[PDB]
Amino acid sequence: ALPTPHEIRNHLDDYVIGQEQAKKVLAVAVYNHYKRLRNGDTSNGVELGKSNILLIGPTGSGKTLLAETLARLLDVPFTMADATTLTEAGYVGEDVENIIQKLLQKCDYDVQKAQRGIVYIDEIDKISRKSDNPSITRDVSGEGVQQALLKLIEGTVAAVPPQGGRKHPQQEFLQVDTSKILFICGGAFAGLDKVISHRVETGSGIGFGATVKAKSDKASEGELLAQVEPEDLIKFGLIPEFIGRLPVVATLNELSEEALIQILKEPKNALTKQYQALFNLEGVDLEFRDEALDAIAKKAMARKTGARGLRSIVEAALLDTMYDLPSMEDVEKVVIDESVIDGQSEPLLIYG
Amino acid sequence: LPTPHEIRNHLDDYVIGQEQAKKVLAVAVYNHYKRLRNLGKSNILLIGPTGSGKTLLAETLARLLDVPFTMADATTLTEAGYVGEDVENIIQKLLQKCDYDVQKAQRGIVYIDEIDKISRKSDNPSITRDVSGEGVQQALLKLIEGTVAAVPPQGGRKHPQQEFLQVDTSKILFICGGAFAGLDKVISHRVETGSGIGFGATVKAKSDKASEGELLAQVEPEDLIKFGLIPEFIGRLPVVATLNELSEEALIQILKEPKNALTKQYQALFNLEGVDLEFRDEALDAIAKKAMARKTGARGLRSIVEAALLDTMYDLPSMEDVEKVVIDESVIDGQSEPLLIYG
Amino acid sequence: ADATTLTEAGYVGEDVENIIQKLLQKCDYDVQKAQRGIVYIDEIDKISRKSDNPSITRDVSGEGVQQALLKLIEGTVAAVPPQGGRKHPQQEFLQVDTSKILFICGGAFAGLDKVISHRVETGSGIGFGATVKAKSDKASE
Amino acid sequence: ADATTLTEAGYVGEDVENIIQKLLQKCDYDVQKAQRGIVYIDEIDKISRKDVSGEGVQQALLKLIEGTVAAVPPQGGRKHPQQEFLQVDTSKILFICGGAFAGLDKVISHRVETGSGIGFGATVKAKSDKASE
Amino acid sequence: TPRRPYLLRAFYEWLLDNQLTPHLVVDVTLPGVQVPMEYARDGQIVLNIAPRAVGNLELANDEVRFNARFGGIPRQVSVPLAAVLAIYARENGAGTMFEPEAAYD
């Protein structure tokens, strides 16, 4: 039978941490999508619409990781795209229809399979309009892309060449409906926190009655992102019709020290395991300490770049060690201590 | 032949709240049908906010209609010679619906959606040229006034025997949709004298000022000229239809009155799983307030339902011994969870 | 490659995918070789955005290039054209993954030292309590 | 042609190259005939030193007056990357620059004429003898 | 009826399936052609018959008309079958010709 959301959540939890809200929305949507596919009519006398998902989260919050991991557990066609590459029709940039072609290729050019599938569009915030009002100048990669996607999300037939445009004069373009194709958007939306701050927080002027946050009690971006409405995105710059196509919005909290520590060893493709395998294939063993992970998390959080910061710290710590390690010989195991991260000590070496 | 009563009555099931828009649509169809049996024409223009039912009306009109009908988008349209589609392609889609009957196509109706997207704009020095603005409006304007335009000869087979069908669009009726953004601001300058610092000067607060729906009702062609549309384009269309923002009462009806009501959609989703669902009138009232606050039309309603049944639907299939589900106003407020009926 | 000439997709400037086309020429148009190839970038500091410039005006040379290189750097399928001269939507292009390709960016950031000194030192101030720092005491670039 | 319409590169789009294009259209895109053509400029004024184009527009004309090769479309069409541009040498094209200057006479008067301008005994232009200008 | 158009279809589709870029040869000297004389040389002009090269391609027995860009400007080209001489793939040596038609004279 169809898997329950709890099962799907467990698979994603293996690779993602601290994103319970995002995992719940994705699991529920996938669960509903499977039911819609199971029943052709999907209802006796009603039509069930699709609720497109939006994923607003800070950098390195596992937005793209969720889509990649979900593809492994999924069965129906899945595809990822980049909004920056997309451009309105009649320009050098890639067309919107090309997105469906990628999904169409995954299902062996089966129109029926493509009719029911999941689509992921990353970097949606990059195509955001500069201002809420209409742009005085044409935006090929901005407002134009959004306007073109309005019909696609709502549901409309699309023309795609089966094998090659030049294979035939017209190719009898395959007609594929997108009224039952789920779409998941992902973006960083840098600076959006300022918009919610202006709306939520008031009375910041110079006065006795006016209150000052003092930059210490100010709501963090993670918690502040939770409070969001379509009007906020409008100020940031986005077509209101586009927001109407995305009814469900999910927020991802910023990773904490405890969350980062888990990422070092808990996930399958963990940073520590990656370097361990790199040293293992060379003929060396590696060891880690809990104190070292704690210090790395603190420094990584200070970088303000998400999980990517971890790779920066570890790489700088093993720069000298990795440089002179192959030159040496008779070494079997390496041990990393907290002092090594601080730079006041060198990693210990074990000789066979 | 059919009087506008059954047209508006049958159409009332799917769309509720819009009064003036329905009358204009039914009148146009009634006049078109009478004219078809035996002068001129009158094109319709729909200027309404997002989620007002513009696209919904066209879909419902197709079912009630008994002549060729097709829905097209203006974004894909591009000037001739470019990779993008051309205005002539619209006629081709119409032919596909009528089995490519030239005579039937001439008496068919064509509806274009998202027309506000195309508009004369800046030179864009970085790009080579603008092919989706004035270039596509002049060719389209020629089609509105009524002119023969070359189209593929029905695409039945590789060789249609030199048919080269050209269809006169004079008899064909053209209806334009689109949800213009910022038009209310343009109308404000013409209908608002302004504000002054003096006591006598009238100042309007955010609440006292009229909403976009009121300004849209007072729209004139002059406003559309400076908005980015050709003056001759709007002049060709002699009928202007305007919608208005929905109300709490209208939103409440949409939740359960239409045959494709949002509540019925989720109910069927739960019924197929062997679980019953119930709704309360008080809950719908709260949902209308939240949806109206979002300012996204009827689409905002879905955002509230999904947010309320997120945790519920996540754990509902895992659990067993569930017979019915009851939702109260407190659930919408986020201070409780839906009640479950076991056994 | 040179980041200055780069421009986001949909403009007269060459697209970011053109870089992959250059790599393919070196490896005799081998998809497998390109996936394991190395890429160097210069003038990366020039594409830096202008904080003073308002966001109302779109930047394709500096901001558009950075936004486009995100997916390419992290690893994504790129529809590299066969020759790179033009990229028509109807035209067919080769698919080359960048999940394993390595990129090296370089650039002489002008004025970066000033920003670092302001944050690291924070010694400005004329008041009696505020500390005074001599120009010689300032650290080297 | 009108000098005011011309703009520097990177602006709205008017360029000095378009001037040669107009000349070619008159001679049916004949490069040899264009070299012998007599080019004329009108309304040279209103463009000068006080960013805005201003004097920058004039700077593009420098190479044109002295003589240089200019890229022009093959058949007077919009610039397309998928095409070649013909080269026309302007080293033999005579240039006639004409314009109406407003205020230049006042500058010359201070230099050559001896008057106290705004003065009780100073001469004023009330005699209506515009011929002196 | 003349054998030039029916033969053109067979050779045109045959080259397409072979993945070769088919090209057509036109005789501008014969009347009815519509092509620029500047490009035509030796009383003949090679017009690409591939679908991408032209627009709104339609092949009929009476006449064939295509939309193509000559020098970067859009233009309309219509040529009668009598003017057509041979169809061959310019990329490779493979080529075929049309036998003389009596009705055309």
Binding site: - | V83 | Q90 | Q82 | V46, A50, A53, V54, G55
Partner: peptide, 11 residues
């Protein structure tokens, strides 16, 4: 080829 290899163009 007097005619261009591609009739459709992109701005």
């Amino acid at each position: 080829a007097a005619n261009d290899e591609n009739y459709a163009l992109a701005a």
